[PDB]
Amino acid sequence: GCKGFGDSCTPGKNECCPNYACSSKHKWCKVYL
């Protein structure tokens, strides 16, 4: 399914679920708070 937190997601490709913000520094998933 989708990713969660601290997962390797690509920014612009929406690899993580619709509840996190993919970072562009090391391509990791994290909360948007």
Q: Say if residues 29 and 22 touch (Cβ distance below 8 Å).
A: yes
Alpha-carbon gap, residue 18 to 13, rounded angstroms: 12
Cα separation, 25 vs 1, whole angstroms: 23
Q: What is the DSSP letter of 22?
A: E
Strand partners, 30: 21
Amino acid identity for residue 18 in this structure:
P
For 24, phi then psi, to 5°, come to -105, -5
Residue 9, SS3? coil
State both tokens at 31: 């909360």
Tokens 């997601």 belong to 9
d(CA 29, CA 20): 6
Sequence-distant (6+) residues with CB within 8 A of 30 are 5, 6, 20, 21, 23
